[PDB]
Structures are given as C-alpha cells and as structure tokens.
C-alpha cells in the first residue's frame, strides 16, 4: 500500500444535505466528491455502512455485510413510478430518526410492491441474480430481518428455539411463509449496492479514494451471529457470557461496556478465520482503504463479564492477531488496512500494526494535555505512514472541544502552533489553525470532519461516546459547504505540499 502526501475529508453519508430526512446515494454525494475534487482532496472517508438498530449507531449493525437501507436513493423508484414521495416534514441540519424510521421503511415497502408490479424483466433478473450471487450472507440477513416482524422486534437470541436454534425445518417453513418480506430486506441490499457501487465509480473517476471503516467486534443482535454462535462466546440461551469494552480511562472512570459479542478466536482459527476473509473482501468491494476500530483488540482485548453492568470488572485476553495477519497477508496479497490504534496502547500493539505496515492515526484534539505528547506532529513517525485527524467521529467538533479545553491545554495549543508559524486571533479560528498544522505535519494523509471545515460548536457533533442518544444525527445544510471551503482548503493543500 501506497500512500502519496494528499488530504480528505470525513463525512458520513447520512450528514449529506438533500430532501426526504437523510443523507443518501445520489446527486447531493455526487455533488459532495466534485466539491472534494475541486478542493484537490483525494481522500472520503466515511463511517460503517451497515442497517442500525437502536442508537442508530453504524458501530453496532444488524450484519456486518448488509448495506444501511436508509441510505437508498428513494428518487431513481420515485422516476420509475415504483413509489409517490411526500415531505411529512423532516428537520434541517439533523437526522430524526424517529420520524425516519416511520416514514422511510413504509416508502421502501412501496417501492417494493411498485418494483414487483412495474418493474421490466431485465431488472427482476438482475434483482434476482444479485440475490444468488451474495446468498452466502444475504439469506441470513433477509429472514433475520424477515423473522423480527414476525416476533415484535425481538432479538434473535429471544426468539422461539427452533428458530433461535436455526433448527432445518423451523428455517424452512419460516423462508416460506415469510417469502416475500425476505424479499423485500433482499430488494433493500439490492438497491444500496447499485447505488454505491454507482457512486463508487464516481469517485474513481474523480480521482477520490473513499476510506471505510469497520468494528472489530460485531453486534449480539446480528445475523452472522445467528448463524454462527459457535464462533462467539455466548450460552446455551445464545446470550453473551462475556462482551467487549475498554477498561477505567484516564477519560471514563468506569470505562466503556460496547457489549459486543466476544469471538471464540480458537474457534475462528481452527475454522480458517473465514468470517474475516468474507469481511474484508466486502469492505474492499466498497472502498479503497478500510479502517479497523479497536485494532489493538487483535492483540489482546478487554473480557468484561455480562453480569457486570460497567467496564471496571474484567481481564485481558490475547488474540491471534499476528496468526490472522499472516493469513490476509498470503490470501488478498498487500494488506490495504488502517490501524484505529487511539487509546492505551502498548508496544505488542505498535509492532503488530508495524509489522504489517498498517498506518495508525493521530489525534490533535489530544496533543496538548501535557512536548513527548505522540499526537503532536514532531514526534509522528519520519516515514509518515500515519493518518492525522482533527477529531474524529467520537470527538467533539474542534470549536467545542477548544470551547471546554483546559487553560493549560489552551496555552500550549497557542504555543505550540506558534513555533508552526501558525497564529490565530478569534476562538472560531481554531479548527482551522489545527487543520494548517495537521497539515504542515509529516503525516501522508490529513482527514477532517467536515464540521471543522465549517467551524461548528458542539451541536454538531457526530458522536459522544458513552451516551446512548442524540448520535449519528448531524447533518449539512444545503450550501453550507461552500465554493469558498473548497477554495481554503485548496489553498491550504496547495501550501503544504499535499495537492
Ligand atoms: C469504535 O467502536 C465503538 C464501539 O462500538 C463506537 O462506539 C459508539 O457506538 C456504540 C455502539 C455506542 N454504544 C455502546 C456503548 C456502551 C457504553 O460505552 C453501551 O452502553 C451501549 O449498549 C453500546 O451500544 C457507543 O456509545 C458509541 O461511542 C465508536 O464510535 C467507534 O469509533
Ligand atoms: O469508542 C471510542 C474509542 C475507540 C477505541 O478503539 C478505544 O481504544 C477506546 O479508546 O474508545
């Protein structure tokens, strides 16, 4: 893996701007990679592309294959006559879900039963050969999905046994009764993968690379998981005995419990690690470079036990994580993977990640709490494999983190950015002036949020990790994003060599 001096910016599909309550694959994300182009960004990066449940979180999806629904273009059916669009009046500059969730999934239902009853030959065979070609996941996630209306939502792990159980016949008979909402969840894929597929082809013709991103741990309420019980370690109920999280920050007193499944990596190996295989193959389907939060979990990982309602409880365990890597390495060839390596890192970690020439990342947000700092751009690697944020997703937009900073930390981000060259007079200023000293620094890549571009407070913060609430919902106002933007950040790559 190559990568050349060159900066991106991080956005969401869902945060685009555009009618009908959501961000999604069509003219407004073209419109978003041109504005990316014209500001000599090469880079998009955006966050798990997966259907989410409650929390609307990416992070914690109903398959590690699937493609968000909410994300499908309704406008191309719309055309076709297949469904009759109407405003019920979503909110500016934010995603409600709530109101999405009850409008968007009657659309789509719409679109589906217009699809079946307009639709020409040629598309019902395509349809119908995209179905055979992903069955090895799509079968799974179809009835999953297919059997929560058939048992209040519930999660599989609480459905009837031979259900849970996935015994023959109880599958059979329930792919028969539920035949055409299987092929309503089946038709949802469809759509997202054309249409990403579609926009995909559209950056690559405007010289963009986008930038996945997926969790090393998958959700408990999951199909593969489902499917696959015996590569997790959960009960004979199918509920996890153990889930996953970081132990008591410095940051959170009583840590982060995700409850994520934990993988049986015996299990795994002895398997052939094949979950990871099929997983990496589909993200690079998608993108051209994917991201790993939690990497450090290939080495060892935090064991919190399920009757423990915090993260302090727990223990680490070590992972196979060198046995995989050499396992991807002599399968796909070059491994086109980024290290999400933030939090307590330990040497294991750092050669893991080196040894497979895996670009870790680099957090400004956090480079000023106290000169040895490894977020501060003179201590980044001479060889500049390293990706250089801002903030991410999980941060606050840089104006409000700066807003609640320390007085020391403030100082020394003055300082600092002075022996940069780098100055400011106004507190407004201050994402940008990050941004110039990400990029001066030696990282290959520099990516920020798009909400630093716009300069914005804490109210359009993407994620506050620990809160269960409020996330994934911020969203651009149409022509926020400017021609003058793109003319900064231009200007800005232009001056240091990353144009
Ligand atoms: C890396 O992965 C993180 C873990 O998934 C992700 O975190 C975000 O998404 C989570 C699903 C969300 N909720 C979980 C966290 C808890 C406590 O920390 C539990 O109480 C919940 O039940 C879980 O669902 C996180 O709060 C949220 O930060 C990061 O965004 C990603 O970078
Ligand atoms: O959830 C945000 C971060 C993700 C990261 O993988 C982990 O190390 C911890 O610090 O929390």
Same mark, same amino acid.
């Given at each position: 893996m190559?990568?050349?001096?060159?900066? =991106?910016?991080?956005?969401?599909?869902?945060?685009?701007? =555009?009618?009908?309550?959501?961000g999604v694959l069509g003219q407004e994300a073209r419109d978003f990679l041109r504005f990316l182009k014209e500001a000599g960004g090469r880079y998009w990066q955006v966050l798990?592309?997966?259907?989410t449940g409650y929390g609307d979180s990416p992070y914690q999806s109903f398959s590690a294959f699937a493609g968000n629904p909410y994300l499908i273009d309704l406008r191309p059916l719309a055309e076709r006559g297949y469904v009759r669009l109407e405003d019920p009046g979503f909110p500016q500059g934010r995603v409600?879900?709530?109101?999405?969730?009850?409008?968007?999934?009657?659309?789509?239902?719409?679109?589906? !039963? =217009?699809?079946?009853?307009?639709?020409?030959?040629?598309?019902?065979?395509?349809?119908?050969?995209?179905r055979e070609r992903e069955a090895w996941w799509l079968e799974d996630y179809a009835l999953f999905m297919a059997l929560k209306g058939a048992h209040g939502g519930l999660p599989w792990n609480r459905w009837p046994l031979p259900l849970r159980k996935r015994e023959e016949k109880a599958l059979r008979e329930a792919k028969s009764a539920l035949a055409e909402e299987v092929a309503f969840h089946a038709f949802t894929q469809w759509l997202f993968f054309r249409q990403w597929g579609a926009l995909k082809a559209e950056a690559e013709a405007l010289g963009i690379r986008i930038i996945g991103d997926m969790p090393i741990f998958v959700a408990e309420d999951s199909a593969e998981v489902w499917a696959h019980p015996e590569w997790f370690h959960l009960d004979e109920e199918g509920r996890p005995t153990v889930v996953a999280g970081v132990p008591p920050d410095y940051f959170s007193e009583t840590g982060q419990r995700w409850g994520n499944p934990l993988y049986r990596w015996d299990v795994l190996e002895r398997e052939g690690f094949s979950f990871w295989i099929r997983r990496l193959e589909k993200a690079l389907e998608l993108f051209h470079l994917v991201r790993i939060d939690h990497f450090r979990g290939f080495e060892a990982y935090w064991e919190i036990p399920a009757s423990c309602p915090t993260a302090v409880e727990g223990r680490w365990v070590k992972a196979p994580g060198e046995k995989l890597f050499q396992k991807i390495q002599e399968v796909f060839g070059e491994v086109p993977v980024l290290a999400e390596d933030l939090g307590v890192i330990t040497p294991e970690v750092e050669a893991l990640r080196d040894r497979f020439g895996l670009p870790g990342m680099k957090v400004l947000q956090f480079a000023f709490d106290x000169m040895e700092n490894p977020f501060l751009p003179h201590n980044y690697p001479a060889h500049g494999r390293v990706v250089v944020y801002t903030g991410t997703h999980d941060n606050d937009t840089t104006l409000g983190w700066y807003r609640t900073a320390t007085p020391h930390e403030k100082?020394?981000?003055?300082?600092?950015?002075?022996?940069?060259g780098?100055?400011?007079?106004?507190?407004?200023?201050?994402?940008?002036?990050?941004?110039?000293? =990400?990029?001066?620094?030696?990282? !290959?890549?520099?990516?920020?949020p798009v909400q630093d571009v716009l300069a914005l407070g804490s109210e359009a913060r993407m994620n506050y990790p620990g809160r269960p609430s409020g996330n994934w919902a911020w969203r651009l106002l149409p022509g926020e994003l400017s021609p003058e933007h793109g003319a900064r950040l231009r200007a800005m790559a232009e001056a240091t060599e990353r144009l």
């Open positions: 190559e990568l050349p001096r060159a900066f =991106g910016l991080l956005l969401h599909p869902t945060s685009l701007p =555009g009618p009908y309550g959501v798990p592309l997966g259907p409600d879900y709530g109101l999405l969730y009850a409008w968007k999934w009657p659309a789509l239902k719409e679109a589906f !039963r =217009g699809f079946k009853e307009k639709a020409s030959p040629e598309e019902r065979e395509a349809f119908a050969a995209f100082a020394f981000m003055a300082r600092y950015l002075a022996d940069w780098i100055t400011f007079r106004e507190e407004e200023e201050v994402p940008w002036a990050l941004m110039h000293l =990400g990029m001066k620094s030696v990282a !290959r890549l520099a990516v920020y």
